[PDB]
């Protein structure tokens, strides 16, 4: 380990006693944008090709860490195979009043109710424009960029909010995420998606992103049936499974366990894996899934891959372990793939459903 141990057992715990969660978040974004990051060689086993793109490795940074697109380059430096920014809202909005981010150290969990604090499409548009061609080279080198699209608190036409997002940031993105799963803000989902896809199809070819839908882990069985049906009917390019949970699993110990918000981290892990498993089966393994929820090790990552994920993301784990957790997850995942007889990540995708 080395750096891993220093960060996990000394640094992060020190920073956590000195800074509230949102200050820590804000300072992490600044340092990451500045390249102030701890100083793992990518191997051919971790490469994934999906959503029409090469991913040097399958470990991405989930939405919500870089909501405004300020640290994209620093996140590739940290070793993420792909970066997702957002959620971005059409117009700028401040989000919920503070405090709105809460630490549950005894559960390796976080509760957040940011409320889609966003700089807005226009600010984020120019931020991405200033590095558009640098990003084109990154994408070509297997380091793609995703943009997560939200809706303003006050909007009166949710589908037009997403359509404006497709129009404004779609041309700068490798894939788009239609986030219909924040807990902080069937033919009707079909209405929404039909309209996002038509707007996406209306973009010039070199500027035409894949479109993914991100779902909650709190869906009824009927909701998952209806989502799987529409996704396959409309040709949605993939799913992100899952957002945070508004449930509170039995056994939470943190004093702030009853704060309103979505719960992330280790108590969400297997709820998210089970939702990946179900969605993979309802879509017959034909719809790429990015698996997200409580990933902090190679075993966490592989369990979601085996359940049906082509790619994984993490966020809360970064808040406890720091940047070295990216190399840790990737090192452990490679070793586990060899240990279980998988030629590479690709071979492991959905492996549980074939056993
Ligand atoms: C503080 C915080 C903010 C988040 N903001 C967003 C967001 O704006 N949009 C989004 O789709 N997901 C958001 N998420 C969800 C993450 O992208 C991810 O789905 C979730 O936290 C599970 O992964 P994790 O357990 O590894 O963190 C947020 C999560 C956290 C903890
Ligand atoms: C809620 C939340 O976002 N929490 C959080 C996220 C990230 C960090 C960090 C960090 C870090 C550590 C070393 C170098 C650099 N650039 C950044 C801390 C807290
Ligand atoms: O901005 C938020 O509060 C937020 C959005 C989202 O999609 N997920 C989450 O946990 N929080
Ligand atoms: Cl648990």
Q: What does this protein look like?
A:
- FMN binds at residues 63-67, 87, 148, 179, 214, 242, 265, 294, 315-316.
- Catalyzes the conversion of dihydroorotate to orotate with quinone as electron acceptor. Required for UMP biosynthesis via de novo pathway.
- The active site is at 182 (nucleophile).
- The protein has helices at 3-18, 21-33, 72-77, 121-129, 132-140, 158-169, 187-201, 221-234, 269-282, 298-307, 316-321, 325-339, 345-348; strands at 48-50, 53-55, 59-61, 82-88, 101-104, 109-112, 145-149, 175-179, 210-215, 238-241, 262-265, 289-292, 311-314.
- It has 355 residues and is of the alpha/beta class.
- It has one domain: TIM Barrel (Alpha-Beta Barrel), CATH 3.20.20.
- Strand 3, helix 3 and strand 4 (82-88) form a beta-alpha-beta unit.
- Helix 6 (158-169) packs parallel to helix 7 and helix 10 crosses helix 12 (325-339).
- The longest helix is centred in the first third of the chain and has 16 residues, at 3-18.
Task: Give a short synopsis of this structure.
This protein has helices at 3-18, 21-33, 72-77, 121-129, 132-140, 158-169, 187-201, 221-234, 269-282, 298-307, 316-321, 325-339, 345-348, and strands spanning 48-50, 53-55, 59-61, 82-88, 101-104, 109-112, 145-149, 175-179, 210-215, 238-241, 262-265, 289-292, 311-314. It is of the alpha/beta class.
Question: How many individual domains?
Answer: 1
Strand content: 15-25%
CATH topology: TIM Barrel
Rg from Cα: 19 Å
CATH second-level architecture:
Alpha-Beta Barrel
Number of strands: 13
- Major sheet: 8 strands, parallel, barrel
Taking the alpha carbons of the first and last residues, their distance comes to 34 Å
| Classification by helices and strands | alpha/beta
The percent of residues in helical segments reads: 40-55%
Bound ligand species: flavin mononucleotide, N-{4-[(3-aminophenyl)ethynyl]phenyl}acetamide, orotic acid, chloride ion
Specify the CATH homologous superfamily. Aldolase class I
Give the overall shape. Answer: globular
Q: Kindly report the spatial arrangement of strands forming the biggest sheet.
A: 3-4-7-8-9-10-12-13
Q: Name the helix and strand elements from N-terminus to C-terminus, one letter apiece.
A: HHEEEHEEEHHEHEHEHEEHEHEHHH
- Give the C-level CATH assignment: Alpha Beta
The total count of helices amounts to: 13
PDB class: oxidoreductase
Keywords: alkyne, oxidoreductase
Assembly: monomeric
Entry title: Crystal structure of human dihydroorotate dehydrogenase with new alkyne ligand
């Amino acid at each position: 380990t080395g750096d891993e141990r220093f960060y996990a057992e000394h640094l992060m715990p020190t920073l956590q006693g000195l800074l509230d969660p949102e200050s820590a978040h804000r300072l992490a974004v600044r340092f990451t944008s500045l390249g102030l990051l701890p100083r793992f060689q990518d191997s051919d086993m971790l490469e994934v090709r999906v959503l029409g793109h090469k991913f040097r490795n399958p470990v991405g940074i989930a939405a919500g860490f870089d909501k405004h697109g300020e640290a994209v380059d620093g996140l590739y430096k940290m070793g993420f195979g792909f970066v997702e920014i957002g959620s971005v809202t059409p117009k700028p909005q401040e989000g919920n009043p503070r405090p709105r981010v809460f630490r549950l150290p005894e559960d390796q969990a976080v509760i957040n109710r940011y409320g889609f604090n966003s700089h807005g499409l226009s600010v984020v548009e120019h931020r991405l424009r200033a590095r558009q061609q640098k990003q084109a080279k990154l994408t070509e080198d297997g380091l793609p960029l995703g943009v997560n699209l939200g809706k303003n608190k006050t909007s009166v036409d949710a589908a037009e909010d997403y359509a404006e997002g497709v129009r404004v940031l779609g041309p700068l993105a490798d894939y788009l995420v239609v986030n219909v799963s924040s807990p902080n803000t069937k033919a009707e989902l079909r209405r929404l998606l039909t309209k996002v896809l038509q707007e996406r199809d209306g973009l010039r070819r070199v500027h035409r992103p894949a479109v993914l839908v991100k779902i909650a882990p709190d869906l009824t069985s009927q909701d998952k049936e209806d989502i799987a049906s529409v996704v396959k009917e409309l040709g949605i390019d993939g799913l992100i499974v899952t957002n945070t949970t508004v449930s509170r699993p039995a056994g939470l110990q943190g004093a702030l366990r009853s704060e309103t918000g979505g719960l992330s981290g280790k108590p969400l892990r297997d709820l998210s894996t089970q939702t990946i498993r179900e969605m993979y089966a309802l879509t017959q393994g034909r719809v790429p899934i990015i698996g997200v929820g409580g990933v902090s090790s190679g075993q966490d990552a592989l369990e979601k891959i085996r359940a049906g994920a082509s790619l994984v993301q993490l966020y809360t784990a970064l808040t406890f372990w720091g940047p070295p957790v990216v190399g840790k997850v990737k090192r452990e995942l490679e070793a586990l793939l060899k240990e279980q007889g998988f030629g590479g990540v690709t071979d492991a995708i959905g492996a549980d459903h074939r056993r």
